[PDB]
Structure formats: structure tokens, C-alpha cells
């Protein structure tokens, strides 16, 4: 339009794909598949499914750290994810498998105020654009956010065009960087 006779309304749309070489870019393909791309070769696929891939309660983080073999950026993202979960107290909910250097994590999401809510809050914040469709309501419900899916599976993946619902954006990860270790519980006298 034309406001005050001389001023025309004009618009931008930032291409945040160009931030890929410095930043993680998070975005959504469909309601059950979301991605965090780190560069043009690596990323994490977050997936809400009823199909579990880990049938054990182990999560051998110390052995993985001792062996290395993993991408440090992806492990940093996983650490930011886990430390941003509010009120995590059921360790058996989270299992994982870092054998061979890969990254595979599984949060067991099986009426609110529970660990599934804490996992889902950090999930939707991590992928801010396009996570509302994954939720049952998508709005108006925070303390009892919930999805019908039973497992959140985070797996390392290679780069491909995945943002068919939302554009790539670092805003969710950059927001959650301040959330790390902010709403965790003490498990020891000496942390």
C-alpha cells in the first residue's frame, strides 16, 4: 500500500540458510520429522514415533566420551537439549546408543507435570518453527503440553533439503543456549 502519500510498504524475507557455516539451523519437514543441520554435511533428526529403536535402559555417555568418535557439535547440541529439559528426574526414560561414534538418543514419552512434558517443551523450543503442528493443541497449553507419540528419537543424519514446513532458523537453539542447567534437579550434595 501507500501510506501518507509518499511512503510505500515493502517487505523482507531473510535467507538464514547462509548462516549454516557458523550456526545450527533448525526446521521442520512434517509433524513427525524435524531437523537440526550443522553445516552442509551433518545434523540431528528429531522424530516423534510410536516405534522404539532402543530396548535397553543404558545410556553410556562416559564410554562415548572416552572413545570420542562422535561429532563434537552434535554432542554439544545433545548436551544443550538434555540440560534444557525442565525437572528431569526419571533417568530410565532416556536411553541412547553411541556405539561406533554415531549419536542415537531415545526419550520415552509414555495427566501432565511429568517427564514427557519436560522433553516435549525442549523439543518444541529446539525446533521453534514448525513444532506446533506436532503437538495435540499447538497453543494455549504449556504446563501440560502433550503429543500422542510415545518416543522422541534423536539420530545423527546427513544433510538433505528437509524444511518443507518451516524455513531453517537458528533461533530455537540460540534461545535454548540460555536454558542450559537452568531448571535441572540436584542429584548430589556436590555437583
Amino acid at each position: 500500500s501507500l501510506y501518507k502519500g509518499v511512503y510505500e510498504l515493502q517487505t523482507l524475507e531473510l535467507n538464514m540458510e547462509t548462516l549454516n557455516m557458523t550456526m545450527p539451523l533448525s526446521c521442520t519437514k512434517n509433524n513427525s520429522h524435524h531437523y537440526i543441520m550443522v553445516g552442509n554435511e551433518t545434523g540431528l533428526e528429531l522424530t516423534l514415533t510410536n516405534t522404539s529403536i532402543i530396548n535397553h535402559k543404558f545410556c553410556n555417555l562416559s564410554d562415548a566420551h572416552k572413545k570420542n568418535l562422535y561429532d563434537h557439535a552434535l554432542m554439544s547440541i545433545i548436551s544443550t537439549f538434555h540440560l534444557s529439559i525442565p525437572n528431569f528426574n526419571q533417568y530410565e526414560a532416556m536411553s541412547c546408543d553411541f556405539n561406533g561414534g554415531k549419536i542415537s538418543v531415545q526419550y520415552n514419552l509414555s495427566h501432565c507435570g511429568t517427564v514427557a512434558n519436560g522433553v516435549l517443551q525442549t523439543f518444541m523450543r529446539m525446533a521453534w518453527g514448525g513444532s506446533y503442528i506436532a503437538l495435540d493443541s499447538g497453543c494455549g497449553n504449556w504446563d501440560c503440553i502433550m503429543t500422542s507419540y510415545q518416543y522422541l528419537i534423536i539420530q545423527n543424519t546427513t544433510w538433505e533439503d528437509h524444511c518443507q514446513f518451516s524455513r531453517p532458523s537458528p533461533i530455537g537453539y540460540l534461545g535454548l543456549l540460555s536454558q542450559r542447567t537452568r531448571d535441572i534437579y540436584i542429584s548430589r550434595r556436590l555437583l
Binding site: 500500500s1 501510506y3 501518507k4 509518499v6 511512503y7 510505500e8 510498504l9 515493502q10 517487505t11 523482507l12 524475507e13 531473510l14 535467507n15 538464514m16 547462509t18 548462516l19 557455516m21 557458523t22 550456526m23 545450527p24 550443522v38 553445516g39 554435511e41 551433518t42 561429532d71 563434537h72 557439535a73 554439544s76 547440541i77 523450543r125 521453534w128 518453527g129 506446533y132 503442528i133 499447538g138 497453543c139 494455549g140 497449553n141 504449556w142 518451516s166 524455513r167 532458523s169 537458528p170 533461533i171 540460540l174 534461545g175 543456549l177 540460555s178
Partner: protein
């Protein structure tokens, strides 16, 4: 703390200031430049998503230009300087508005006024979204009118 990263895009212009978003920094658009009067507001205002995005893009440019890349990508640098570049509590405000079913900025689309003859432009403000649907221009037309009045005032 507070954002401190300064935008340095003064060379090869008619005024020492402003900032230019190249065609790579924009979706389906060409080089678009903003003057010193608009960009200078970014040094002071704490609630502009576009200024945060300008600092992010400028830091990306300077980081690729002035730092030796690693063999495999690492995100140590952004984890180290994000609070220097942006206001994370602005992102917190937008998330709070998202969960409250208020329109919010998803940092994608922005709007500005542009004087037809002189070419002077205002600082781009964010086009708010709600449940995947951008707000029409009619939803915030009075904001556009106030911005035009501010432009005429200066």
C-alpha cells in the same frame, strides 16, 4: 549482559553508516540497503528482531572472512558469542507470545516503509505470525501509520 557487536558496512557508500543485505541474505530478492539513520537505532533498542538478525548475519560474514575454518564444523564460536550478538530474551518474548496464542515474530519476514522519491526507509519491523498464518496488513495498519508519522517527524 547486553548486545555489543557493531555493524561495519560503511565502505563504498555516500554516508559512513547503514547496512546492506545481499541477495544471498534474502529470499527471492536482490541487494537491499538501509541508511545510517535507521541502522543506528540498532545500537540502542533492545526489542528489535531485525537488529538481532543484522548482528547475526554480520557476525557470520566476519567469522567466515576472518577465521580459519576447522576441518569439521564446530559450533563453539556461536555458543561463545550469541549473547554478544542478540537478545535471547527477545526470543523468550516471542516464544511466550507463541504459547499464549498472541501473534509473534518467527524472525523470517519483516516490513518497512520506503519513501518513493528520496528512497529513505525506516528500520524493518517484524511481520508477526500466528499458527502458521501471517497477519494481514490490516491487523497492524495503525503501526504502519505511526511509523510513517515518525518518518515525517524526522
Amino acid at each position: 549482559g547486553t548486545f555489543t557487536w557493531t555493524l561495519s558496512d560503511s565502505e563504498g557508500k555516500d554516508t559512513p553508516g547503514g547496512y546492506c543485505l545481499t541477495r544471498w541474505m534474502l529470499i527471492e530478492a536482490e541487494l537491499k540497503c538501509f541508511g545510517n539513520t535507521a541502522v543506528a537505532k540498532c545500537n540502542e533498542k533492545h526489542d528489535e528482531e531485525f537488529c538481532d538478525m543484522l548482528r547475526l548475519f554480520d557476525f557470520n560474514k566476519q567469522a567466515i572472512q576472518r577465521l580459519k575454518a576447522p576441518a569439521q564444523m564446530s559450533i563453539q564460536l556461536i555458543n561463545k558469542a550469541v549473547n554478544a550478538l542478540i537478545n535471547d530474551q527477545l526470543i523468550m518474548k516471542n516464544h511466550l507470545r507463541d504459547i499464549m496464542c498472541i501473534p509473534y515474530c518467527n524472525y523470517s519476514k519483516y516490513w518497512y516503509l520506503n519513501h518513493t522519491t528520496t528512497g529513505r526507509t525506516s528500520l524493518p519491523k517484524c511481520w508477526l505470525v500466528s499458527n502458521g498464518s501471517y497477519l494481514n496488513e490490516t491487523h497492524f495498519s495503525d503501526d504502519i501509520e505511526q511509523q510513517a508519522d515518525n518518518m515525517i517527524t524526522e
